[PDB]
Amino acid sequence: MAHVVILGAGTGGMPAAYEMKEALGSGHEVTLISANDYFQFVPSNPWVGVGWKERDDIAFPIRHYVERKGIHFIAQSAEQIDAEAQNITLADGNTVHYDYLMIATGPKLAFENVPGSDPHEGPVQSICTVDHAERAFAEYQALLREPGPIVIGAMAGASAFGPAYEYAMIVASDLKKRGMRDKIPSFTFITSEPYIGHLGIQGVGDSKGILTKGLKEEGIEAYTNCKVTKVEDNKMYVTQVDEKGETIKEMVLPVKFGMMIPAFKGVPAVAGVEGLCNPGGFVLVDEHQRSKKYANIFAAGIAIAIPPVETTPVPTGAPKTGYMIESMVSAAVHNIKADLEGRKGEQTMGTWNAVCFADMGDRGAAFIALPQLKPRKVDVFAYGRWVHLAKVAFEKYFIRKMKMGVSEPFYEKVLFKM
């Protein structure tokens, strides 16, 4: 009977495919469609960007692992979605009909917001994708051959601030390990955050003080409330505002090596569905992950819309992170299954939370924050070896699971208790 399509094979989409097939069984067709033929473990990208990891450590071909599970895989980008006819048009012009569609397309990296900021058009690189992280590293090596000013940070509208700090810190660390640090004219951190360690979540534990001291310790000069208007002639044009939005300065910073986390928007094939998304291209869903306009469209991951709780001097967004994403996936699968069986599924993603782990080498920083608005129930920022062991363990676990299959509540990791 019912044909369920999962669009996008990333952090939410890959497990979604397995969980979907596992829940529906042999009487239903599950098809996974994605723009790339390989899965990549995104949290490892910053390390790739500094050459501490290789593509081969963090990426692998999808086909065999999902097909052996009875899942169909189309390594093709969706270009157009007709929600009325329920047809997806692929890059190669073929079309795929669906009865249920689960959108897990992740972020469009919106380099267009800042002219000249695209990794291919200037010195400002990116570590959001393994492709980009490889490019970043390559440029980093050029920096090593001809030392120059470094600029790392997060654009206006960014939501993934952790990766910016992680990358700045591991770059400094790598520079030192190479006895190359003191050869750098200047190393500067530019962020749209209202203050250091805001992280798009109004700060967590002592994120402010600890990240502030960390940057200072590494001789990284830091500026907040910044937006970049353009990257041009290897200069970054920065405007810094006050709490009221008024300009308080403009800077022109030269860049030999740069990495700025861009704003995320929804991908075009999805943003292009009339009435499906908010103006940023994010899918508007109810608490059950069901599209508010189309009863047979669900969504999970960065792709869904989550309303802001704060309005910062420079536009910033709140991060969507792995544990909450899996919780969205789990609800979507349950609720589609319920549709395929009469009921309206009642499962939700649960309490909003942000969880992030960043490895520095032998130790790391991690935070856990919930719910979204303060006063919170848990508001922890921690640094230690346990964080490094956690991150290493989790990468290994997730990757193995993406090869072996996922049947169950993803975090039996909480069995290290029992």
Ligand X SMILES: Cc1cc2nc3c(=O)[nH]c(=O)nc-3n(C[C@H](O)[C@H](O)[C@H](O)COP(=O)(O)OP(=O)(O)OC[C@H]3O[C@@H](n4cnc5c(N)ncnc54)[C@H](O)[C@@H]3O)c2cc1C
Ligand Y SMILES: CCCCCCCCCCCCO[C@@H]1O[C@H](CO)[C@H](O[C@H]2O[C@@H](CO)[C@H](O)[C@H](O)[C@H]2O)[C@@H](O)[C@H]1O
* Sites of contact with ligand H2S (CB under 6 A): 159-160, 162-163, 264, 302, 319-321, 356
Q: How far is the CB of 415 from ligand H2S (least distance, A)?
A: 24
The answer to whether residues 381 and 206 touch, using CB atoms and an 8 Å cutoff, is yes
Q: Which of residues 149-178 bind ligand X (CB under 6 A)?
A: 160, 163
Residue indicated by tokens 């990257």: 231
DSSP 240: E
By CB under 6 A, which span of 58-66, 98-106, 345-353, 402-410 interacts with ligand X?
98-106
Structure tokens at 264: 């995320």
367 contacts ligand Y (rule: CB under 6 A): yes
Cis status of the peptide bond prior to 371, with omega within 30 of 0? yes
**Number of Cβ within a 10 Å radius of residue 346:** 11
33 contacts ligand X (rule: CB under 6 A): yes
Say which entry of ligand X, ligand H2S, ligand Y, none residue 11 contacts (CB below 5 to 8 A, set by partner kind): ligand X
State which residue has the least CB distance to ligand X: 10
Single out the residue of 87, 384, 392, 396 in contact with ligand Y (rule: CB under 6 A): 384
Say which entry of ligand H2S, ligand X, ligand Y, none residue 365 contacts (CB below 5 to 8 A, set by partner kind): ligand Y
| Residues in binding contact with ligand Y, number by CB under 6 A | 16
Q: How far is the CB of 321 from ligand X (least distance, A)?
A: 3
Structure tokens at 322: 């792995």
Cis status of the peptide bond prior to 375, with omega within 30 of 0? yes
Q: How far is the CB of 127 from ligand X (least distance, A)?
A: 5
Q: CA 178 → CA 334, 350, 358, 405, distances in Å? A: 50, 45, 21, 40
What is d(CA 159, CA 216) in angstroms, rounded to the nearest whole number? 23
Q: CA 159 → CA 90, 261, 316, distances in Å? A: 29, 8, 6
φ, ψ at 89 (rounded to 5°): -95, 125
Q: How far is the CB of 80 from ligand X (least distance, A)?
A: 9
What is d(CA 365, CA 362) in angstroms, rounded to the nearest whole number? 11
Chain residues binding ligand Y by CB under 6 A are: 162, 165-166, 169, 210-211, 214, 356-358, 360, 365-367, 383-384
Which positions touch ligand X (CB under 6 A)? 7-13, 33-36, 42-43, 45-46, 77-78, 104-106, 127-128, 160, 163, 267, 269, 301-303, 321-322, 325, 355-357
